[PDB]
Design a binder for this molecule. Structure first.
Ligand SMILES: Cc1cc2nc3c(=O)[nH]c(=O)nc-3n(C[C@H](O)[C@H](O)[C@H](O)COP(=O)(O)O)c2cc1C
Length: 317
């Protein structure tokens, strides 16, 4: 019966602005921030506030949905220091990225690179668990492996043995990328059966039926949705309650609200890039988004795209 739905971390997509917009019209149980890249220093407080403005609102979006800071990096001492800082600043626990393809800085790997030696996941997660007060959660997000799923149980074991609270599994290897035909929710179930912490299933959940299938196959009562949450802006309610997808006119209203939200540190091109990007996702689902994208793709500045989006009369749609 009960179902948890998490909004995925998405670097360069799901910032605080889009989290604000989406959580207002959804029932997400938790959102994950874009990653804070940890190398070999304690990051200043402003980095956390930039990535997670919700820290100044008791770790919640304006509508009240919890948000959790994610770290990306390798060195245990520095993951620990930065985890402690995230929670000192108010984060509801802390998450560790072990699934994103990521550039190594000097000797400091991160993300999917850690899947090549599961011990790196154990050491990083353990140092975070030890640094974060015991009542607050420490989560880890993984893929099934690097170039195969052969180490998928070692990866899962590393997270549990580190004392992590919960595990998100993206049901593909790194080398399988985002290829739909390679999703393996069964592998997620096999991991769940071995563990004693909640497993949150992730990958290729787009609608009510796909979530039902995912839960049935994996045995997980918790899922995480990333790209689908942009394609269908009310996807949490689609998945939880089998409600219809957000009508297009309400999608346009959402885009209009986005054009009126200010972005901290914006040089001037934020809305141009981000409205085009969101439309590039929406065209997978909404015919109308393909047409609107053709109209706005030629605009090269935020005021022009703001005027264009705002000009649309949603009562005429
Ligand atoms: C543009 C983009 C950025 C992402 N950034 C992150 C990130 O910052 N941290 C992370 O752990 N995963 C990141 N991911 C992976 C997603 O959280 C998620 O695991 C993936 O998109 C698969 O789920 P989906 O099929 O529901 O999209 C990103 C994915 C995309 C497409």
């Amino acid at each position: 019966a009960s179902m948890r739905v998490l909004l995925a971390p998405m670097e360069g997509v799901l910032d605080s602005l889009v989290r604000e917009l989406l959580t207002e019209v959804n029932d997400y149980d938790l959102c994950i921030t874009e990653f804070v890249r940890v190398v070999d220093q304690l990051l200043p407080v402003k980095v956390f506030h930039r990535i997670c403005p919700e820290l100044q609102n008791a770790s919640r979006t304006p509508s009240g949905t919890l948000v959790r800071v994610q770290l990306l990096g390798q060195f245990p001492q520095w993951l620990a220091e930065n985890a402690a800082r995230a929670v000192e600043l108010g984060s509801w626990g802390v998450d560790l990225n072990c699934g994103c393809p990521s550039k190594t800085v000097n000797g400091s790997g991160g993300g999917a690179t850690l899947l090549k030696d599961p011990e790196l996941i154990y050491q990083g997660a353990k140092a975070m668990r030890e640094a974060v007060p015991a009542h607050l959660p420490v989560s880890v997000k993984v893929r099934l492996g690097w170039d195969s799923g052969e180490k998928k149980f070692e990866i899962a074991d590393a997270v549990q043995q580190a004392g992590a609270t919960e595990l998100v599994v993206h049901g593909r290897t790194k080398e399988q990328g985002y290829r739909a035909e390679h999703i393996d929710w069964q592998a997620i179930g096999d991991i769940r059966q071995r563990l004693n912490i909640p497993v949150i299933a992730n990958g290729e959940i787009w609608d009510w039926q796909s979530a039902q299938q995912c839960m049935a196959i994996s045995g997980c009562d918790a899922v995480m949705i990333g790209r689908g949450a942009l394609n269908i802006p009310n996807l949490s309610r689609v998945v939880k309650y089998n409600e219809p997808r957000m009508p297009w006119p309400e999608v346009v209203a959402l885009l209009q609200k986005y054009t009126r939200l200010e972005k901290q540190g914006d040089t001037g091109l934020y809305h141009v890039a981000r409205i085009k990007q969101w439309l590039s996702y929406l065209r997978k689902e909404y015919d109308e988004a393909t047409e609107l994208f053709q109209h706005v793709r030629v605009l090269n500045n935020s005021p022009d795209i703001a005027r264009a989006i705002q000009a649309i009369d949603i009562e005429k749609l």
